[model samples]
Target chain A: MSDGRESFLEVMRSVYERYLVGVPGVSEVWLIRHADSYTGLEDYDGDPRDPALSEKGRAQARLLAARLAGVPLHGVWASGAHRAQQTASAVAAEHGLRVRTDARLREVRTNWDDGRPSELKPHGVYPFPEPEKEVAERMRTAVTAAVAATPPAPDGTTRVAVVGHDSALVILMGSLMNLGWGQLDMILPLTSVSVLAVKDERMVVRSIGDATHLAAAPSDVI
Target chain B: SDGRESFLEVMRSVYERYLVGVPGVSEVWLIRHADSYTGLEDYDGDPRDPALSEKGRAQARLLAARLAGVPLHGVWASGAHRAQQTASAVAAEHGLRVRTDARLREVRTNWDDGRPSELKPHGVYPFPEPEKEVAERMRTAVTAAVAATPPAPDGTTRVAVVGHDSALVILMGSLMNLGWGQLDMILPLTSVSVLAVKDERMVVRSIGDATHLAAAP
Candidate 1:
């Protein structure tokens, strides 16, 4: 029940104290959204692949790299999509790490199979149906398993970084924190960062939508 | 004799004459290779740490001098460091801007040979399996570059692009829609190649013309 504004070190401490007690080995999970990119018109219909970042997206990726320059990262994961890959590449390049592409980390697939174009409309509403319940459940199950199976680092400092699509991250965050199913629908932004701590066999939401680094540089927000 | 046509104009005329009958060409100009520090491979056959060589700077200056009189509509460069450096120099000289296109990137090479002990020199084609997707992307870039412009209202509106040798050769082949055998004739372009578009047709006016290298101090 802590506010999301705590310093990263403090959050790390809280995460260790709360989540890693019974688990023989403890690992930290860092979830970051892909930096900004152009939002194409096709995204309105909930097409996960349609929205892309503009030139500003590339700049934001660089900024994210600079922000995380000092952190000791163990592994990096990214959605297989172009935008997500591009975002993850910037950070990975800065740290001399390779990004592991995970298809499961893709954006939640909206119910755009009804023969409607997946493009976003001018007003932002998708032309397709909302995501089906079964699809959502499957995504949740996959994400949960992936997060749960993350092995501790050789140094016993389990730090994992996952970069994925917006909707997928929001849904995963909601599940990890036991936030009601739809609660995440309103909180996540395009390039938000969230950190989750697992302790005592329970997950605590340490921070959500921490974009302070991006706030002052509004132009960097795609 | 009216000092009206600068080097850019002469280059433009050469391009126009070359592309007289090809379809879908809009505009064309030569792009000098960007700032490259080292050749593709170092002493060994390993993957070279690709950068702008000293000669690359001279190439950029030559491009700047050639393009001084032209009003460029847009400038495009491959995402590689060398091509980007070359594009930046030309852009700075003309006081214009550059847009990077990933599709213009050089062909990907396999680094099977270790970094220091490899046999191939830097910039040397490793002759690895040609990546079809990368080649297709390069073709798409050429088409996009051609379609990105409108017909010149009064004079020829030139669009300059800096890219790698392999990709540019593939692009030139696709511009003419040539088959495999024609590749050798079009590839290994020395440094800067100019293709012109007149009346929406591609003209292969020049390929790998590097006379500018002779002017380097």
Candidate 2:
């Protein structure tokens, strides 16, 4: 089963390269992972399902918003989680736009123990409790809808921002970039920004897991 | 092409179901050499091997500090002076020697006509170094760097390769199964791109991350 998955992805990847040469879509898609959700409180349990940003996380999101303030944005969207909305709202407010929420942007329901998401320890395990394929489809659908709704700017460029979880954004980028299986293990820092741009009609990653804005801010944690 | 695109979208729907997660154990950091003194006022050296300009050196310092926390096992550079200078600054912080590999050097060019390469239209001169050749040499250089470094306790290894603009761009496109002509992107001076490998799968973590240079003195 494991071997089949790798081979199948390779087959699809080659197909995309051969066929999708210049299909037009959004000019750029910005993927922002929500800021820190842990509030440093021992009693924070139920909120794990939908936690708000901590003080440091708020600072981080502000820095992220400021970094993107100059770039024109058509629309901003976020997952249903509070942290995701908080982070996206910061950027949306900067552009005088409201954040549109999408339930499909939620994180993959990976294996959990004691009601907490546990890290995947094994190398090649199918870690998600939810259907990995469905998770990927929902994300793609959401992004496609977002793109259709956003009108291109005067410069003939359409840019949309999506604030989501690490796992969700990983899946989004993984499928779009045709990343290999090993990409599932990759970790994107809180409030990090990843960019994908349409060049010559195909999606090309501009940057990923960029936390440079945090270098000038606080929390003291990388 | 439309028929092919539609068919591929169907294939995506079918194959994404079997998509499983695999872990990575090694990373290759591709760093574009900083701005050089090619046509600057004080530079009269070989245009192909110009040294780093003042701002370029400053950018390198910032890059080095930005990556100071990473436990890099080895730092490799192209034979070009600018690449070596940039890699040396990064290697210094890691307490490692800079490994010079000509394979990672800049693309060969013939510009005797005095027409700046950038100003000249694309294909003005048959790429002195075919894109395939550049990709092959870069792949070999990266392979050598990986072979030289041992994995850390956590079963992961990190290596940095400082190279030229064209070479790095071609290598990146090659890794993503993208052809040279299809890659319409540019790598700014002193930018960083990351490629991750595990088992047989490779993923590009980032490309052209030069945010640190925004505040360079």
Candidate 3:
């Protein structure tokens, strides 16, 4: 390398050093909670094993699908639940990719699921299952595992939309983003897509509840 | 420590850690487009990337009016048409060419023209834009912009980059150390974020300044 010439290598290093100092990397993970779904409509006869998205829920999913029609998705995944899979189905079709199911994204395990412990909190915070720590552990383990499958997105960005429930997803997000009260409230919403960007252990959240596309889509009054 | 030294240190920690390396920016005027896309009812124009609409052209006029007294050395803009249209007015004022860069485009961009525009609009979590990409492109732009800039009689250099909400966030956030979830920040259509650099230290003078847009064209 001649001394007089401005080496392209130095220019590359200069740019790298500048941006890496603050926030960097790809779609660490775009944590999209499933679109609108039935909670306990009509006298509560609905099965909870994996309740399907209500009619309105499906419509929302379709909108979200069309909304993301042109998006560049590396992997589309969902929890092993009817609603999550249902929401993911549209996304899968959008990218001509199949949905990969992972339990890590399943709804939070609460004692009530087993018909044993207690009701969720007054604030709507789920009182995680008997082994609280265990539920949280898988949230990290499973979410991270899916993130691993994405090749370091060209330009260090890759978008993988993981459909999961409020409680489970929030637990993971809250800890990573150090989310507080009001912020947590905003984090949990129907079909709300939260922007979670990560690189190595550094996580940079760009948004909490992005649902702009749904504004024009059909809506359910419930 | 002398106040000046302390100020320099803070500037480094804030400007260097985030903004591009060395020769920190003196001042940057970031302006959003007048009306890119359509009405909120049509497609939730807030986040969606569409060409500037008719009304946005009016907005462009008013925005152009607002920059009348400001003297800028150079102009920069994103590749998006709306951005070009927005920066078009400013560059014309001083016979300056509006430089373009992909890094200055929007956040989480790709299709939807969606890379950097990912900051707020819809609030979806953004894909971590490679800092390396931002670093390199931004470094190049910053160097060129500054060099092209001719300081005022008293040695104050000023430049402007006509950009979008998400695009501004990437440049501002990177230079200022303002992290993501910076969605709370609102850079309305044709809004401006003024950056000022003094004695090598950089500081944001104002952001989302749209008082000028409220006027009748």
Candidate 4:
């Protein structure tokens, strides 16, 4: 009696209702950090400018692709870094899109010292990490423009998924959510999603760092 | 010997180059949204604005897939739930937001002109316009959307409009200099029509192409 052709409008309705439908004309953006960055060669090179995804990162990218495949995304955006591109390729493929790039999605430049972790500068005297202020603003501006750049989704709601790196993304979310830099630790986990809903220049914190789909990874867990 | 990376590179470059040509030329595309409501879904009343149904949503995604590659300058949609749904799907693919206008919706003749594209198909309005009048209004909406869309920063100026069946059909008829009611079988959902508006003239390059709407076996 059935050709086994199944359609899931409810499934479509369910995930969409979860985010980006709060406002009259736009639900703002659902900011996603890149799936994972290849960390193996962090200390081996002076060029923090480029790094591809780790093998684990490839798994993260595939999972993200599966979860977002049928979501009818307006765009798969990336800061255009190789790691970010590598992460977004799967998701874009799922939606039949190519990653739209913006320079602002670029990660912060690591200091002259590539001796330790290359994402941030070393705290004076001590080997610790801190956010770069310039990269932080660029992230804010890029995201702000990206959100504003979206013409207005059909439901009068705009949903954009932006990919970026750890430090800069978290810092920008901190400002958007009115949290201090120190309090942004929990929002930067690998393969996490942060949803920000805006209406009439006023925004509401719908949710932050959601990785519900990332739970219970398959036998080949990342 | 070739691998996925090389394949992806080839795919991205070819498709990106497909529509993203320099603004030195001219182009325009008009698309119709997938099937929508029966215009009737409610207990007490006889009308409801049904969103895209199960199959309709599938068509929406499929159409989005069709246009996801070729670079686009901008996107526009009629302000109706069905039209919006279709536009959003493609808009998301292009990383562009959709601009909506009511003038592009399914009704223009003030009365139900016995045309399939109507607000209340059974009702008669206090005022009704001729087929030519409806064609005139539809033409205006299409021209505004096409003319206002500039090339992308990449120098590619291509735009797409998502709208209704009758509205699109009437526009096509007018563009082709046919009688207002002179087209048929071209009203399928999720179909696309393309035109080239160069120097001061509009040329019909393609009409009612729905290769993307081909259902699987």
| Index of the highest-TM-score prediction | 2
Model 2 lDDT tens row, A94-164: 89999999898888874431244343234345556676677767877777777767777666456788998
Give candidate 1 regions above 4 Å deviation: A1-24, A39-52, A111-151, A199-202, A218-222, B1-217
DockQ, candidate 3, vs. native dimer: 0.03
* B86-136 per-residue lDDT for model 3 (tens digits): 888878987788888655666543323322221223334344555446545
Candidate 3: residue A169 lDDT (0-100): 65
RMSD of each: 24.6, 12.5, 18.6, 21.6
With a 3 Å backbone cut-off (N, CA, C), the pairs that clash in candidate 2 are none
lDDT of 2 by residue, B1-217 (tens): 2132332343234222222122345778889988674234345665446789877888888889778866788999988899999999999998999998899977775332333233223323235677889989988888888878887654347889999877887887777666654444456667887777664555555667766644332
What is the lDDT, from 0 to 100, of the residue A165 in candidate 1?
65
| Model 1 docking category | incorrect
The order by descending DockQ is: 2, 3, 4, 1
Q: For candidate 1, lDDT tens digit of each residue in B1-217?
A: 1121232243234323444323444555545465442443232222233466666666677766655655666788877676777788777876667888887866654332222112233233333536456557865776687677665554445677888765676565555554332333222112445555654455443444433333243
- TM-score of each model, paired residue for residue: 0.39, 0.57, 0.47, 0.41
**TM-score (C-alpha) between model 4 and the true structure:** 0.41
Residue B161 deviation, candidate 1, in Å? 52
Q: State the fnat of candidate 3 relative to the true structure.
A: 0.00
Off by over 4 Å in 2: A1-26, A39-41, A113-119, A183-185, A199-202, A216-221, B1-30, B33-103, B106-162, B165-190, B194-205, B210-217
lDDT of candidate 2 at residue B35, scale 0 to 100 = 68
- Candidate 3 lDDT by residue in tens digits, A112-194: 45655343243334445534355557877776787787676564357778888776765665565454322333234456665
Report the C-alpha lDDT of model 1 over A131-165, residue by residue, as the tens digit: 53443465555444545656555654556677876
